[PDB]
């Protein structure tokens with residue numbers, strides 16, 4: 001099961017290739033500029049076997065509740081109606097969003113008490129590091 005070291009509140013402290021990740025999904029040019037400046041706070045809670053990942057920003061807010069391996073509907077920060085699944089692999093929390101015959105993965109790993117986020121999309125690789133607060 002998901003390591004409870006994921007639980008807590010994480011604050012973004014480093015972003016790489018996110019600008020290109022955003023652009024690579026079709027994110028509106030207005031929603032783009034505001035995402036390159038956002039430093040969201042991420043809160044991972046649990047309530048039995050349901051995992052909730054909240055994304056709190058000044059700009060926007062998002063939130064997803066799910067069970068591992070079970071497909072759910074997600075509406076993304078940039079308004080994408082996706083059909084996502086979250087799986088566990090070697091301790092990494094891999095989320096995959098599918099829509100319009102497209103697909104992207106968000107692997108959330110832990111590295112030295114800090115959470116790393118690998119976002120893939122058509123050869124684009126974003127990397128965001130998160131510090132527990």
Ligand SMILES: CCCCCCCCCCCCCCCC(=O)O
Pocket residue numbers: 022027031034035036038040042055057059060076077078106117119128
């Ligand atoms: C997460 C900032 C929201 C504002 C920017 C909107 C366009 C981004 C769309 C996809 C969400 C980004 C996923 C990376 C977040 C993470 O690593 O926790």
